[PDB]
């Protein structure tokens, strides 16, 4: 299991979004460059970045900040936000982003999305789930166990699933893990300090954490030695 620093990005400031009952909104001094070359030189070896402004609207995706941060950062940088066509993703790879995350258009276009997947292949492609629990754990009306099924079976190697309730759902991934060996799990949301790093451990493949490493509850060397095997 390794660390995945992220960062969020809204016209090139660092921010992130709180959520619950009301999405607020909290902007943060440091530079994003800057930022990722401090995770980078502290020992991070996959970076994520969310691209909230190209989310929002795909005729402003930041591409140019993008670029510029793929060529300086000499690690894996992975990259999402309501990404949602071939020539998205193509134009991301191009950049040096090693990693694109889809998801947005899972269900309502499985189609587009197993061709993004034959034509750039399955360790370039990540595939982003949301996740709650009903009776089941379901899309967000498809059990999410069962769309995982289907994209298995075509060669998807990546996901980045979220519980989005949330510390982190270990039971959530302990059994996607127990029924699918296979898929690099990515763990998303609810990480609130080293003892959810601890808990992952062995379980999924990487852990996204964002706001834990901004507000400095834990440090990228700490979180990188709990996960050391």
Known sequence: TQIIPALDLIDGEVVRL??????????????????????????????????????????????????????????NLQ?????????????????????????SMAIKDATLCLEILKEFGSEAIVLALDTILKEDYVVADKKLMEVLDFYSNKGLKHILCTDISKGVNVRLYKLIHEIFPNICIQASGGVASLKDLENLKGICSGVIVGKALLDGVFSVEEGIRCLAN
């Open 79 to 103: 990259v999402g936000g309501g990404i949602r066509s071939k020539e998205e993703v193509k134009a991301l790879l191009d950049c040096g982003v090693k990693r694109v995350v889809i998801g």
């Open 18 to 75: 709180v959520k619950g009952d009301y999405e607020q909104k909290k902007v943060y001094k440091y530079n994003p460059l800057k930022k990722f070359k401090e995770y980078e030189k502290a020992g991070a070896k996959e970076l994520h970045l969310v691209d909230l402004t190209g989310a929002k609207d795909p005729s402003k995706r930041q591409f140019a900040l993008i670029e510029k941060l793929a060529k300086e950062v000499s690690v």
